[PDB]
Amino acid sequence: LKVTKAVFPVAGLGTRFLPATKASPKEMLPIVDKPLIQYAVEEAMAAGITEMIFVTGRSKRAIEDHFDKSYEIEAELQARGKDKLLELVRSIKPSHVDCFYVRQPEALGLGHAVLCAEKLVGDNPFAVILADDLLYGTPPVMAQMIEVFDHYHSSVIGVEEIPAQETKSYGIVDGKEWEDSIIKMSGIVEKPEPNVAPSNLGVVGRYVLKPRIFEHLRALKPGAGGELQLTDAIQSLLADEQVLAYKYHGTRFDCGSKLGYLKATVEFALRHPEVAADFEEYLRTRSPVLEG
Amino acid sequence: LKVTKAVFPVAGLGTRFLPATKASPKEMLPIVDKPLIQYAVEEAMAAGITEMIFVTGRSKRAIEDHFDKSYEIEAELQARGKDKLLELVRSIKPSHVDCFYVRQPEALGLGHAVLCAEKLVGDNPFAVILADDLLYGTPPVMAQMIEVFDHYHSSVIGVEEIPAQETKSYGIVDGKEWEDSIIKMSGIVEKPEPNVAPSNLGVVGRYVLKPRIFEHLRALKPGAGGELQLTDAIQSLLADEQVLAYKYHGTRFDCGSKLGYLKATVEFALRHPEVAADFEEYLRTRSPVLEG
Amino acid sequence: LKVTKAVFPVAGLGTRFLPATKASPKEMLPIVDKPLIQYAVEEAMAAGITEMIFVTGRSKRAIEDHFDKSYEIEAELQARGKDKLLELVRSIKPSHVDCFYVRQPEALGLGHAVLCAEKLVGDNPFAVILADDLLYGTPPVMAQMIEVFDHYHSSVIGVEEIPAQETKSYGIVDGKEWEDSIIKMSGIVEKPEPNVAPSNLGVVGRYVLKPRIFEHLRALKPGAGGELQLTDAIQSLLADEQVLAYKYHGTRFDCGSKLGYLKATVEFALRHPEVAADFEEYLRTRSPVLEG
Amino acid sequence: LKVTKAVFPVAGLGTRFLPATKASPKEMLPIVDKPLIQYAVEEAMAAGITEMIFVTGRSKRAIEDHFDKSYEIEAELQARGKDKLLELVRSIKPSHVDCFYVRQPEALGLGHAVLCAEKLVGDNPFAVILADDLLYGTPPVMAQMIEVFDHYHSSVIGVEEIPAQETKSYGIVDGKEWEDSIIKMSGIVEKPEPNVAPSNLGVVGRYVLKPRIFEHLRALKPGAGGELQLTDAIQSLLADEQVLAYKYHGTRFDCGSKLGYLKATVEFALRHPEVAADFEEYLRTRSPVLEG
């Protein structure tokens, strides 16, 4: 059983980024020169995934027009004779990668977004990648997680040791450590108060899910708006079969926050061949007072 | 004669920002949490301008959907009970500000973009603002320039002392200094070699133009694609009436370049009440090695 | 004072055409092979008008994409070598015609839509054309009305004799005939009861307005939703200066109704070079029974 | 093995409908008050199909916005208190129906569009429905064809008797009749000359295909542009397993042609609750002269 598909929820309101996210989801925010969602798709590609399923909401066109062919932009590029840039634009969606679109009509949360993709995933394991968790890993984090999935044939939840006083911001897993970095999960709890959290292992926006999850999602009684909690479906699933938590190696930038977006911008600029040296020299010599 | 209108060319390919500008013009790039074009519109508003004319090209919808009312986003905001954010979203286009759209069908340069707006400006003086020149001024730069225009009733070209070896990147003005910061222009030349440049005063993306400019634009024989050089029209205009260069005070970020975009991000983050303190402490303590 | 501008309110919900108008304004409905709004723009062009001002609302993109350039459609035509269809596509917006867009954020009616366009019209007389009134006239109706305006330099209201029992569907004018088909208006009333209507001359969706109309729209007490009844502004205007009603020659199809749209389709098909002869023969021989 | 999925190629350039199809695919053309593609989706729904796969090209947004939720149109309906029109709008995409989108970046024909959808169909039989073939059948034609598929578990090709001199416009099947209206196919040929055509049974835009078809599409030598002739893949398939042609009962309108579109408009108008009686009376009494 090989994972060839990834589901990307890309209806991010980005309240912490208004007004920038007025007309585009937060997953389209650029880090230096590349949208968050493209980093995420490239991470999926590095894990062997070739079918990208985008679950869109408002401003779907920012996502669609990013990955779909643009005749007008290739015209402008061809007209300016910019041949390297032409191939850069084509590489956003290589020929062997497919992009499919499905709608989440109402912003009803992650579990609902996953369930919307059910009949596009079919009877197949699949990745779920939240692009506002920007991850740097060697190899990429989803590639690490596909290694785990290929070995154990169990769902894999990406987790990270987080500060004990911040457990109210994370889903928190419980279980016994198995091998290095792998926890056989006995439970998952959504945003526990620090004094009740069963561990310091918080869920990050990376999952490999076996298709049985859809069955458990469908069984949940929804909330007020109709929200389905993916955590409740995961909790229900591990009662029936093995579910693993994987402590990935790498660095996370929480680009659901402006601070994390700024850290990501700084770190990736300093790795960017076009600007790294000049940007470092700028940080070293900048004046503290902005003159108007 | 009061300036109530501003023309914003917003068909920026952003070759230096591909792939981020695949589906949105470079003028929509965010600085922390606000698109460049919104900074520019706010600068025009600070100068008393109330009619915003956007000259669009590819991906016009990123611009239109930013300034036009969104029913879906206000629905999401109302559904989440986020009332301060609701007013933030409404303030993108205050009730007393109008936004009009006109097309530049082909990317044929700035003079062509200005001429496309002729019959929307009418027989009125108007501002031209290039949003990828991000300016910080107290008061804002266009407000400074409208002060000059209201006093002299002559076109005003925003200029800046630039390094002598970089004159090939700028239009360069010539003339006699009049009062503090004001040059009565005798000529303007597009991108001269350093050893021939008549001054070190380079044109930045800010203009106040009297409507006679349209006549001079129309008189120009176009280039290969049909490009019209605004510089040639300005050169032609000053032969007939007074045209002034204004040395504004403030700081410019060249956000047509990735480096300038990064400097702008850093400087405006350190002024941003939500992140300034944490971002400074991050810059002070960050590790030099990114761990994968 | 020549009329060079026309205002086209194109926020038509087409409740009578749902679900067809789900994602497109009713003014984009095709008559045989051409949208209603393109018939209206061609009528304006025949009257010498060269600036088209579209007051958009919901689904603005169907209108914008129709009149703006499309590279992808021209790439598909180019790839199929289909040549005459290129001149046809280019003819949708000839080089000497400008298209400008302004938003009516809330669908508040015709008088309000006219006021939204004020700063695009400036201090100029202008046509107002409701495209869901499809008019066939030789010469075109707006061309007839501009001839009237050029002769009298007064606002012109298009009218037609309507059945006496239908006056509650129309604005109804009153006055005295002055030359063949020209009424010097003494009054206008919005939707009178038949037994109270002062004439049988009902207003159709064609106007030539002098810019004094904007001051009269502002003087109006708004309706409960904020509507400004254009009829009441015309009533106010004619107290200060001459306003004329013009009994145009030609045929109207009320394409605000499904029945008028079908009649229009039949009549224009029977004049269409490609289908007229074959469609008439089909209407002559068609079987009344539809086999299922 | 039930058919739950239908593939709708909707990249139709509608060269015969320009300029109407400038900004909208021909499959969005309305018949009275409903787009062709919605008739096609309703026919699929009547056959028990619940996953609609749209293979888009140029102007994908007209198709997407038709089937996806619109908050602004529902806000305008809500503000006008128009209630039954809400159920009508919601009925465009009922809760139990999923809409998925895949791109055909280059307009390379039907067989190629079917292969583009392969990974959305998976290992499942599927319907293929060309919406510009408007079919009226009681029960609907795809419902008739699914009954055939459920009975024989073989691919089903929709066919109709066509005039012998028109075979160069059709794929033409050959075989032996097996039950009323069912032909066990021995061959199929794309557009034979009349004197060479093996039958008068022409293929219409309705198919039920088993997923073995994808392997046969891949085995085909591509056309000069990269096209894959679906007819040749069906010819290849029937050498390995049973393929049936089904002579449906009902009436076809070729809405790839302006004349068929007009006939469809007339016939469906004459069955429409709101206009049938009044439209028939207009056709009976209409004057042949159009007054200008």
CA distance D241 to chain C (A): 31
Q: Which helix (H) or strand (E) holds D279?
A: helix D276-285
Chain breaks after residues in chain D, where C lies over 2.5 Å from next N: none
φ/ψ of residue D231, rounded to 5:
-55, -40
Q: Which residues of A62-75 are buried (b: 16+ CB within 10 A; e: fewer)?
A: bbbbbbbbbbbbbb
Query: How far apart, in whole angstroms, are the C-alpha atoms of residue A224 and residue C14?
Result: 34
By Cβ distance, the residue of D51, D100, D122 closest to A101 is D100
Check if the beta carbon of residue D243 is closer than 8 Å to that of residue D237. yes
Query: How far apart, in whole angstroms, are the C-alpha atoms of residue C69 and residue A72?
Result: 10
Check if the beta carbon of residue A271 is closer than 8 Å to that of residue A138. no
Query: How far apart, in whole angstroms, are the C-alpha atoms of residue B90 and residue B87?
Result: 5
Using left for φ > 0, alpha for ψ between -120 and 50, and beta otherwise, residue C248 falls in: beta
- Best probe of the C interface among D266, D272, D282, by most C CBs < 10 A, is D266
Chain C positions touching chain B (beta carbons under 8 Å): 4, 51, 60-61, 64, 68-69, 98-103, 105, 119-120, 122
* Residue D83 buriedness (CB in 10 A; 0-12 / 13-18 / 19+): exposed
Residue in C with minimal Cα distance to D68: C23
CA distance D7 to chain A (A): 13
Centroid of chain to Cα D44: 9
Q: Which DSSP string do the residues of chain B spell out, in sequence order? A: ----EEEEEE----GGGTTGGGSS-GGG-EETTEEHHHHHHHHHHHTT--EEEEEEBTBHHHHHHHHS--HHHHHHHHHTT-HHHHHHHHTTS-TT-EEEEEE-SS---HHHHHHHTHHHH-SS-EEEE-TTEEEE-SS-HHHHHHHHHHHH-SEEEEEEE--GGGGGGSEEEEEEE-STTEEEEEEEEES--GGG-S-SEEEEEEEEE-THHHHHHHHSPP-SS----HHHHHHHHHTTS-EEEEE--SEEEETTSHHHHHHHHHHHHTT-TTTHHHHHHHHHH--SS---
CA angle C291, C292, D1 (to 5 degrees): 155
φ/ψ of residue D252, rounded to 5:
-105, 140
φ/ψ of residue A36, rounded to 5:
-50, -40
Check if the beta carbon of residue A13 is closer than 8 Å to that of residue A59. no
By Cβ distance, the residue of D64, D68, D120 closest to A100 is D120
Q: Which residues pair with D161 in a beta bridge?
A: D201
Of the candidates A159, A123, A126, the one whose C-alpha atom is nearest the C-alpha of residue A55 is: A126
Residue in D with minimal Cα distance to B75: D71
- Look-up: residue for tokens 């040929």? D189
Residues of D in contact with C13 (CB under 8 A): 73, 76-77, 80
* Residue B285 buriedness (CB in 10 A; 0-12 / 13-18 / 19+): exposed
Residues of A in contact with D105 (CB under 8 A): 68-69
Contacts 24+ apart (CB under 8 A), B148-152: B148/B182, B148/B208, B148/B244, B148/B246, B149/B3, B149/B125, B149/B208, B150/B2, B152/B182, B152/B242, B152/B244
Residues of D in contact with B71 (CB under 8 A): 71-72, 75
Chains that touch D (3 or more CB pairs under 8 A): A, B, C
Residues of D in contact with C34 (CB under 8 A): 19-20
The count of CB pairs under 8 A between chains B and C is 42
Query: How far apart, in whole angstroms, are the C-alpha atoms of residue C236 and residue C219?
Result: 9
Residues of A in contact with D64 (CB under 8 A): 60, 101
Rg (CA), chain A: 20
Strands C30-31 and C34-35: antiparallel
Chains that touch B (3 or more CB pairs under 8 A): A, C, D
Number of other residues whose CB lies within 10 A of the CB of residue B14: 23
How was it solved?
A: X-ray
The verdict on a CB contact (< 8 Å) between B19 and A267 is: no
Query: What sections of chain C are H helices per DSSP?
Result: 36-46, 60-67, 71-79, 84-90, 110-116, 118-121, 141-152, 212-218, 230-238, 258-269, 276-285
Query: How far apart, in whole angstroms, are the C-alpha atoms of residue D113 and residue D99?
Result: 17
CA distance B260 to chain D (A): 35
Residue type, A164: A
Strands B51-56 and B98-103: parallel
SS3 label, residue A192 = coil
- Terminal Cα-to-Cα distance of chain B (whole angstroms): 61
In the structure encoding, which two tokens stand for residue B215, read together?
A: 């006549």
The verdict on a CB contact (< 8 Å) between A292 and B138 is: yes
The count of CB pairs under 8 A between chains B and D is 6
By Cβ distance, the residue of C19, C28, C267 closest to D88 is C19
Q: Which residues pair with C100 in a beta bridge?
A: B102, C53
Chain B positions touching chain D (beta carbons under 8 Å): 71-72, 75
By Cβ distance, the residue of B38, B259, B291 closest to A279 is B259
- Terminal Cα-to-Cα distance of chain A (whole angstroms): 61
The verdict on a CB contact (< 8 Å) between C60 and B64 is: yes
Residues of A in contact with C103 (CB under 8 A): none
- Terminal Cα-to-Cα distance of chain C (whole angstroms): 61
Residues of A in contact with D102 (CB under 8 A): 98-101
Domains of chain A, CATH where assigned: 1-292 (3.90.550.10)
The verdict on a CB contact (< 8 Å) between B69 and C103 is: yes
φ/ψ of residue C216, rounded to 5:
-75, -30
Residues of B in contact with A59 (CB under 8 A): 65
Check if the beta carbon of residue B67 is closer than 8 Å to that of residue B90. no
Residues of B in contact with A269 (CB under 8 A): 258, 262
Residue in B with minimal Cα distance to D74: B71
By Cβ distance, the residue of B88, B251, B258 closest to A19 is B88
Check if the beta carbon of residue A245 is closer than 8 Å to that of residue A186. no
Query: How far apart, in whole angstroms, are the C-alpha atoms of residue B41 and residue B95?
Result: 14
